Design an enzyme around this catalytic site. Structure first.
Site, PDB file in Angstrom:
ATOM      1  N   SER A   1     -21.508 -16.846 -25.017  1.00 21.55           N
ATOM      2  CA  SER A   1     -21.367 -18.312 -24.656  1.00 21.55           C
ATOM      3  C   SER A   1     -22.446 -18.586 -23.384  1.00 21.55           C
ATOM      4  O   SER A   1     -22.500 -19.977 -23.194  1.00 21.55           O
ATOM      5  CB  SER A   1     -20.024 -18.702 -23.951  1.00 21.55           C
ATOM      6  OG  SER A   1     -19.278 -18.811 -25.470  1.00 21.55           O
TER       7      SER A   1
ATOM      8  N   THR B   1     -19.369 -18.966 -18.139  1.00 24.09           N
ATOM      9  CA  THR B   1     -18.898 -17.642 -18.606  1.00 24.09           C
ATOM     10  C   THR B   1     -19.453 -17.280 -19.922  1.00 24.09           C
ATOM     11  O   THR B   1     -19.959 -18.378 -20.733  1.00 24.09           O
ATOM     12  CB  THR B   1     -17.315 -17.699 -18.638  1.00 24.09           C
ATOM     13  OG1 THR B   1     -16.750 -18.808 -19.810  1.00 24.09           O
ATOM     14  CG2 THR B   1     -16.701 -18.180 -17.457  1.00 24.09           C
TER      15      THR B   1
ATOM     16  N   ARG C   1     -14.334 -11.078 -14.768  1.00 28.48           N
ATOM     17  CA  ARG C   1     -15.659 -11.512 -14.868  1.00 28.48           C
ATOM     18  C   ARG C   1     -15.867 -12.514 -13.666  1.00 28.48           C
ATOM     19  O   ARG C   1     -17.020 -12.798 -13.264  1.00 28.48           O
ATOM     20  CB  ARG C   1     -15.950 -12.109 -16.290  1.00 28.48           C
ATOM     21  CG  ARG C   1     -14.900 -13.094 -16.578  1.00 28.48           C
ATOM     22  CD  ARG C   1     -15.337 -14.476 -17.104  1.00 28.48           C
ATOM     23  NE  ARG C   1     -15.656 -14.287 -18.647  1.00 28.48           N
ATOM     24  CZ  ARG C   1     -15.062 -15.116 -19.712  1.00 28.48           C
ATOM     25  NH1 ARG C   1     -14.219 -15.763 -19.289  1.00 28.48           N
ATOM     26  NH2 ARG C   1     -15.431 -14.906 -20.806  1.00 28.48           N
TER      27      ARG C   1
ATOM     28  N   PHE D   1     -18.523 -13.967 -23.206  1.00 35.06           N
ATOM     29  CA  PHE D   1     -17.654 -13.043 -23.485  1.00 35.06           C
ATOM     30  C   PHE D   1     -18.043 -12.425 -25.116  1.00 35.06           C
ATOM     31  O   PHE D   1     -17.654 -13.354 -26.043  1.00 35.06           O
ATOM     32  CB  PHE D   1     -16.342 -13.152 -23.635  1.00 35.06           C
ATOM     33  CG  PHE D   1     -15.237 -12.164 -24.157  1.00 35.06           C
ATOM     34  CD1 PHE D   1     -15.360 -10.855 -23.886  1.00 35.06           C
ATOM     35  CD2 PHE D   1     -14.362 -12.634 -25.027  1.00 35.06           C
ATOM     36  CE1 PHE D   1     -14.540  -9.879 -24.201  1.00 35.06           C
ATOM     37  CE2 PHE D   1     -13.443 -11.744 -25.478  1.00 35.06           C
ATOM     38  CZ  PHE D   1     -13.709 -10.268 -25.215  1.00 35.06           C
TER      39      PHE D   1
ATOM     40  N   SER E   1     -15.985 -23.535 -24.791  1.00 33.43           N
ATOM     41  CA  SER E   1     -16.616 -22.699 -25.213  1.00 33.43           C
ATOM     42  C   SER E   1     -16.451 -22.853 -26.942  1.00 33.43           C
ATOM     43  O   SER E   1     -16.446 -21.754 -27.566  1.00 33.43           O
ATOM     44  CB  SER E   1     -16.746 -21.201 -24.929  1.00 33.43           C
ATOM     45  OG  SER E   1     -17.497 -21.357 -23.485  1.00 33.43           O
TER      46      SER E   1
END
Ligand SMILES: [Co+2]
Ligand SMILES: [Co+2]
Lengths: 246, 246
Positions: free
Chosen positions: A48, A187, A231, A189, A96
């Site tokens: 993302s 962020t 994170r 993932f 996201s």
């Protein structure tokens, strides 16, 4: 610019048994510090975090009309419930919503996507593996160092896009606001992968603190979703220790 | 362009023995709700809320070079210790550094200042009495409704200024960032005046909540600085009760 390896941050990683890297750069001195020079240069799936260049390209090509663009939900089911509703650019960026950006990428097209990634010097610039999947499960790879270089260009409006579109994406990236500082971040993932080959989690962005600006990029191996919060907590604890935020 | 009185807000004021007004408009300024119809259109000295148009004008005229402009402290005494340091645009706005904006005003000059306030339809557009203090102790006056219309134009990039410059000021105005919303705002405080002639305190801005937007403007009579936090708590409590923020 320059980069130097340090060890004063390692504790934050070991305490959580995390294998990762943090790159923190001070704009005024063009100086960066990291806990792992080797990993700082290793390239991973953007996941993302790719929403940043994707958003810029979408705006520059006209796919995204303007800053007030609303991404209407087609009512059709989506991987997440929070993705099932109308969203603004910032809204789409944060939750996201993959579907929204998959549509954007498809409209941008492979030729133009390739063109901008070359101009942005974005990672290995390999978009093979599906125009709407390359950053998710494709061949695209980018390092923490490349992430901060890219973010600095955005901050300085030096990317090959209009000042207006870069400004639009920068505000959409605001995640924390304080009297003494503003945090722009994103962020990422890729998934849990396996224990043999774990996925990757990211947190990149920059902090405008007083007259200084701190660009940062964090990534870690992850094979279990329960570790996701790390994170942000690890790099946050580091920057708090550096007196940048908190 | 209607203004409708709402009685469910008065309690927030009476509970604090405050004489003031709150104007809230969903989607656009053509239809707003308020606790006091008469006061909603009453005009008051803008104080530091004037930093919003001043910043835009500074950028438009080139006095403020660009988004990364640093306003250097000459080392001479300033009214607040927090003003005695180099500042970015958002930094100066957030700490409400009066001397920085007074210098911007001087460089803008009376002719250009008058021209832009006319373009922005900003209050009574009266800048007489001193180019560096008309919004602080002069005759300039603006109402809560006018503030909302002005902020709406800024939000839509409809003011007579480049889209780039309006975007620059809009980000510098971000004061709260949450997953579901961003709050752009600016406070104001003319001073305490007297009991018979109290000063005025302001809190104006807009909330970008999901795919909806709410413009707001609050002002209150004030003769004691201890009451200043109410300029934020009262309108915050009202917008929280409306389910906008919080
Ligand atoms: Co910024
Ligand atoms: Co905004």
């Amino acid at each position: 610019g320059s980069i130097t390896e340090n060890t004063s941050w390692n504790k934050e990683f070991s305490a959580e048994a995390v294998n990762g890297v943090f790159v923190l750069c001070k704009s005024s001195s063009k100086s960066c510090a990291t806990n792992d020079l080797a990993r700082a240069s290793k390239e991973y799936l953007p996941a993302s975090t790719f929403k940043i260049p994707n958003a810029i390209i979408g705006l520059e090509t006209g796919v995204i009309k303007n800053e007030h663009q609303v991404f209407k939900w087609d009512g059709k089911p989506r991987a997440m419930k929070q993705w099932e509703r109308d969203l603004t650019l910032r809204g789409a960026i944060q939750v996201s919503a993959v579907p929204v950006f998959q549509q954007i990428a498809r409209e941008v097209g492979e030729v133009r996507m390739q063109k901008y990634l070359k101009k942005f010097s974005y990672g290995n610039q390999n978009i093979s593996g599906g125009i709407d999947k390359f950053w998710l499960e494709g061949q695209l790879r980018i390092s923490a160092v490349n992430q901060v270089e890219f973010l600095e260009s955005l901050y300085l409006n030096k990317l090959s896009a209009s000042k207006e579109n870069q400004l639009i994406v920068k505000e959409a990236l605001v995640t924390e606001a304080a009297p003494e500082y503003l945090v722009h971040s994103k962020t990422g993932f890729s998934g849990v992968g396996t224990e043999s080959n774990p996925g990757v989690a990211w947190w990149v962005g920059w902090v405008e603190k007083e007259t200084e600006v701190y660009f940062f990029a964090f990534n870690m191996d992850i094979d279990n979703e329960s570790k996701l919060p790390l994170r942000k907590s690890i790099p946050t604890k580091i920057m708090e220790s550096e007196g940048i935020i908190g």
